């Protein structure tokens, strides 16, 4: 972010001067290939001529500056979340196997079901969201003519057109990181925590330690929560793995220890677990605890265009960068909210997708992201439309003969009274295939 | 619960793809034996014929997953109970020496008796588990035909295939600590200090801390206690060896310092000392201080094999583990409870087993488990039944002549009232062998 | 400040005595070039008549004095502020590129503009300050006449000739820099934080503590503040290239603790990164806070010189040191002051300096650096002088035709009363060219 | 202290038993050479007759004992303010140049001066103290014969007859310091600090720690302070040169750590920077804070010699130390007394001694150590005695023609009433030379 010479030395196996530009290009018996002190034989090589001096600038800029800014970006603080080139055959899908307890063995039951299968695998699609932009700059010739003097101006040169471009994508990412916590926590898929205003008080400050602190020691439970997550799937997670994004005022006010004490890191490894952002601009959100595997990216692709204008001699070059930003469904997740939230946030239906006979039956269960200690009560609903076809009030749905149309179990859960301008209600997808 | 194709890899002594399967096993030429980036024509050959693509999964699947799992299960948090496999000749019985005070040097004393022996060695029978299960699962042809376009397709699959099972045996090896340790304390062989709701306020927890410690020091006294174990035989242990079972909100109530301090380590040497579970739904028990040896467990067997469907075109591969699981009766277990556990908790003879002639005589003591400051009287009994064969009210039991039934010497305390429907009893078995 | 002989044995490859003089140098039949213990001869060979003498103390005092004295001059406490020999062609003018949101990639809105350019570069000029002084000192002819007893009282002789010039120039060096930070402060261009006397009572320290790490929290933000610095900018800073200068009795009174917590360092890489003076003489000037690169020094050159008068008998050398000190207007600097600051400190208009045809219009906008918590409004004024020129009141101004004059946009706020004898001023200086 | 023979064996380049006695040396066909177990060979060698047992005891008890407590003396705690011996030509005067401000470059000023000189180098002379004693031993031929049993018992002769001297020796070097301190404090040119009983209350010792703390970041200034010292000098020190003498009770009283706050070393580098003894024994004093460079100590010699008595059977070794001890005039020193010291000190006369013509004047500057907060009055008086030499009120003396006799200027402050028994009085010596 304050890239220098030292930076793309790094970056490159080279040190200080370079003629692999001209070696790969005539363009060569032009320019000499002296590597000493000399530059003004170079520099009037390289100016003798329009076509000569854009072939070299062009070459320069497109291959160095894509080189280098792709090897710094690459050591940014959040590249544990930047994977390299998307894979093929991706097929915005996951898939995960759900943790069960092991059937006893038996010869007498086994003698009878051997090619049983076990479960489905609770498929579900990526939330994705794509990103493609353009930064663009400017150079004038006399700020390339006044660069040739020495071996320094060269190095100026090259850092002045390097540091504008990265500095601005650095702070792009986290603009984009900011605004993909903001769509899912108004898509309502975050499992909630109530707090009061931390900032507000000191007790409120050491309220939301204690939270956080439990929050993590509920989520690191060696035996499952199924709790978090958009859908009770009953994962487990690390605690090395937890990264928190918190707001600058909060982070501000809090001590840099306790916080990393109710975690097992100190301090050195804890800084590089947190993320501090100014502002979230949704309701009171203010702290969002995320699994490592929870936020990924990938690189569509990075690319350096140039072009000169012969009537204003100068040349703009355009960098663009593509990617594709997904959060993924699996993973533990929790909000820390402060605020007016209903005491039901979602309810959630572990079949979700099913298929079913027309003569067959199918068992519902549901789990209700209540924010207090009360119990709500949940009444299930059919859709769909046909005769004979029903589900009864403990989530057992059956469905009867000459049933041709898609239905969709409903589970409703009242937070109102006699005036109930408010529902929240889950779906489920069952297919009825002909037997 | 997260095993990448990494933990494969450093399992097996591989680099990236391999063909010792198909170097293993005709089979050898339907598959081509590069080792390179080419993976069509490998997959070509894997599906060209059922009889080698079966041979090829069954192979992969049982040697490759059975030796991954099981290198990769002997490195989990709670590996140091894992014994490898179960010696021949075990016999269940343990033997354990007393210490005992040194003889002062005597030649008249000592010149009478030689041959003399110096105590029994007190046997007593170990305390097992049985455990047999299994977890199987399903691959279809779909998701074995599309992992031959790249070798991550290839290793994604193999870690995919892998993974199900080793969550699934991760989780139940805790679950089954749980009810080991459950059984333990209905069993009522652990020694109990009483503690008052940990959670209910500060000063409890403090309490509860400062319990944990004094019990901690006063079990790694270097001289011996003899007040814990299931039975009096004056052990000793160490402070690095103690392993603490606690409850996941005592836990997330409690701060990960002080609790370390109470010990000798400091955090980084102490979080694999202990183990944190999700309730032990038994009364009131909150954290359970066990001897490292206290609980072993010895693997009978692992074993993967597969079956394929015909006509339903898939495989379901089964993974048995069976392997049983003994606490030792010498070591130290402090179950620190918080509730009405009654004053007194388990009464035990010190001689146990014994065996004397017609005419003999044996003394018997007995430590009484109290949970109160109150001291508490014994009475005892001869039970059997015979003329002349008594025991006094110094625990003296004299056996007379012609005597050829068993007996069973009884130690009474009582801690009832004018109506008493509460009596703990000690037995100890006393054979009479003819003179 | 107080260098010995091993300061210069280490700076110069040689060890103990030497031959260098004499080697470089007729001179060198008088002295023998003998290394060993034998001083007498080296000594009587030196002193033998006038010219030798003189030309021996010359040359070892200028050639030897001036190598070592810039050696150790380049190892000072404050050397991370130093650079070698100002670069060439620096034209007292500082460029910076504005951070900017990146343009979303539309191809029918790119194909109308292809060759535009981005944005001004914000032309500033360096705060510069140049110094040029000189020390000097004396030595007499019985210390040389009695310092070639031993190659202890030459070395001695030598470090006595060094030591006061080095802690002359090392002493002054801190007032320089105090002196142009109160410069600084005078102009205005820090952007201050109020306190309330932080040694007046134990709640001030704290309080001033509190404060202190919320501005270096702020100052840290990844995103961008754009708050700070003399000109709105929109820069970013590491934690680590924060430097902090604090008066004296605010340091004794402040523990070395709390303070490094507050930043994320740990006392022994904290200590490297304050600089403590004894009062600032600025009103109420407590502690200033300023960026890595805020503060730079460049040498112009260091020389030393001697003179002998035959007539007393002695030798005058003089050290001469010029340098230049520049302070940057783009870095951060903050001035956390404790007194009676007026509502407003400065309003920047952000274009600075513009130039725009006689028929053209340009937009500005105008930042306002309150110092307390309220709003205030800002009017905007064309000066110049002219027909048809006029600005409205959100900074939009458009020139009329036939204009030759040059004019500066005015922004005023008014923080009075009635009686109103004091305003804010900030001006943009817009030069007109004929179309 | 505890001496064995592991420090003799690494102190001399030995292996156990040697044969260097009676190599050096006839003696030689007296005693075998064998170094093997053999030892009593050697013992009969050795006491064969008189004459070569007188030789064998004196050459072994001078040269083994006065190399053995010459290079174990040096290892003491307080080794670092132990020199070598004392070196050729110290001058006894102390000679230093105060640090100034640098003269602003200018050639129209320059090209009038060029020959001038800079300043007197304020010399003054050293603080010396010498010491020379001795302690003596005896040894019986009965502990001689009964020393060649086996060649421990050689090894045991050794170290019993090394021990008591050494203990001796280094007991009573804390009592010489101990001893200069008090004459230091009772000739009174320390800088004092008033406390008030830091071991009377809890309150007193946190005033004390932090009146410390203040003190020696005072001390540390890097641009000067001149308040300290004997005399105005203006001279800074390094964190790590202070020292501190604190009693026995003081410092048992303190905690380790805090005390090691108060500077910036943590309690394994700030216990070899605290001396303690058992009670100043002078008036109030509490704790004294010096420099580093402020006392030395030379080793004159250190000699054994021995003589034997024929009528008594047995010798005597005396062991004679002689060293002296200085303290620098020019050094930081802190007296941190608590008592009913008076408001003034001492007054400093800063020109000290001067030398001017018959027609000249001079400039004197007075610097009161006060231990409060408010002002008092100097006056000036010339003594001598001549006419037209006089001195007015803000200390500039001129001095008529045709005067012969010294002359000495006194500066007086008086802190008395209206009975007025204490004057504080400061000398300066002024010698008149004819022109």
Do not use: C
């Amino acid at each position: 972010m304050r890239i220098t010479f030292n930076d793309v030395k790094t970056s490159l196996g080279i040190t200080e001067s370079y003629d692999i530009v001209n070696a790969i290009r005539n363009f060569k018996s032009y320019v000499p290939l002296a590597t000493a002190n000399n530059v003004a034989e170079v520099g009037a090589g390289i100016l003798i001529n329009q076509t000569v001096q854009n072939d070299f600038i062009t070459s320069l800029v497109d291959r160095i500056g894509l080189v280098v800014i792709r090897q710094v970006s690459l050591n940014n603080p959040l590249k544990k979340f930047k994977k390299g080139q998307i894979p093929l055959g991706r097929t915005i899908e996951e898939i995960y196997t759900d943790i069960t307890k092991e059937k006893q063995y038996d010869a007498e039951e086994a003698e009878q079901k051997v090619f049983e299968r076990e479960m489905p695998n609770v498929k579900t699609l990526f939330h994705e969201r794509n990103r493609q932009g353009f930064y663009h700059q400017t150079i004038q010739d006399d700020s390339l003519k006044t660069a040739f003097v020495s071996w320094g101006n060269f190095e100026s040169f090259v850092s002045s057109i390097i540091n504008a471009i990265y500095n601005s994508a650095e702070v792009d990412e986290y603009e984009y990181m900011k605004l993909l916590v903001d769509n899912y926590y108004s898509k309502g898929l975050f499992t909630t925590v109530k707090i009061d205003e931390p900032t507000s008080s000191t007790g409120a400050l050491t309220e939301f330690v204690k939270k956080m602190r439990a929050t993590a020691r509920k989520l690191t439970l060696p035996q499952g929560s199924r709790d978090w997550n958009s859908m009770a799937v009953r994962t487990r997670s690390y605690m090395e793995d937890l990264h928190l994004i918190i707001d600058a005022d909060l982070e501000a006010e809090l001590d840099v220890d306790v916080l990393a004490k109710a975690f097992n890191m100190n301090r050195t490894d804890f800084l590089g677990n947190v993320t501090v952002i100014d502002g979230f601009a949704s309701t009171g959100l203010e702290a969002v605890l995320v699994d490592k595997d929870w936020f990924m990216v990938y690189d569509n692709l990075h690319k350096m265009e140039t072009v000169r204008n012969p009537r204003g001699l100068y040349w703009n070059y355009y960098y663009h960068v593509w990617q594709t930003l997904s959060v993924s469904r699996f993973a533990n997740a929790v909000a820390f909210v402060s605020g007016d939230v209903p005491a039901v946030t979602q309810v959630i239906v572990s079949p979700n997708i099913a298929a079913v006979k027309q003569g067959g039956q199918q068992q519902f269960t549901a789990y209700v992201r209540a924010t207090n200690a009360k119990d709500h009560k949940v009444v299930w609903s059919v859709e769909g439309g046909s005769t004979g076809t029903a589900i009864t009030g403990d989530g057992l749905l059956s469905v009867s003969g000459n049933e041709d149309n898609q239905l969709t179990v409903k589970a409703t859960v009242d937070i109102g009274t006699e005036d109930k301008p408010k529902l929240v209600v889950g779906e489920a997808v069952v297919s009825i295939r002909p037997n």
